[PDB]
Amino acid sequence: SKSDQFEYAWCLVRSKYNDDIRKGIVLLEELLPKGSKEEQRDYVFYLAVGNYRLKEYEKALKYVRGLLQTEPQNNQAKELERLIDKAMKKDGLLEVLFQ
Amino acid sequence: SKSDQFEYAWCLVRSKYNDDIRKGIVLLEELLPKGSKEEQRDYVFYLAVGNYRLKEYEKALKYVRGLLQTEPQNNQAKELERLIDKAMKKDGLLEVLFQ
Incomplete structure (x- = not known):
């Protein structure tokens, strides 16, 4: 059933x-x-x-963004985009920490 | 199906x-x-x-014991009983740490 594959993937x-x-993702x-x-x-x-939990921060954003243009005011989506940017800003600091 | 309820519960x-x-347990x-x-x-x-992960150390033992009389030499069961005793010995130290 369809409602059940979700639970498993959830x-x-x-x-x-x-x-x-x-x-969980591929399902x-x-x-x-x-x-x-x-x-x-x-x-x-x-x-x-x-994707966010796998540090696949690019792909994550592409989802939370595509949802956000459908649902501009989903403040759960807004907050998940807010956590993906911070991960990414901190990551690109540690990236260039040695120049 | 039966092979599939397992995966979910696993x-x-x-x-x-x-x-x-x-x-996961009740399933x-x-x-x-x-x-x-x-x-x-x-x-x-x-x-x-x-049960062991829920600190239900009593109930856990009752299982790993019942398996062990069926399968005396399952050294994966032996090792899981070895981790349940240590949890329990440390727990009953912290229990009476104030007398």
């Missing part, structure tokens, strides 16, 4: 282990076409969370 | 969140009668891991 994207988090990507209007809004937000 | 019992771990308890000989050996071992 529990997966929550795991402490990166491998479970890739699997969401397959689940994305099969989605309803607001089912997709939810999958997209959870792909961003997963 | 990913659940692996989670960082206690609530996911209770749900295993329902799954226990439906089991094969060695499917049950596996469920029991994973109920012990889950």
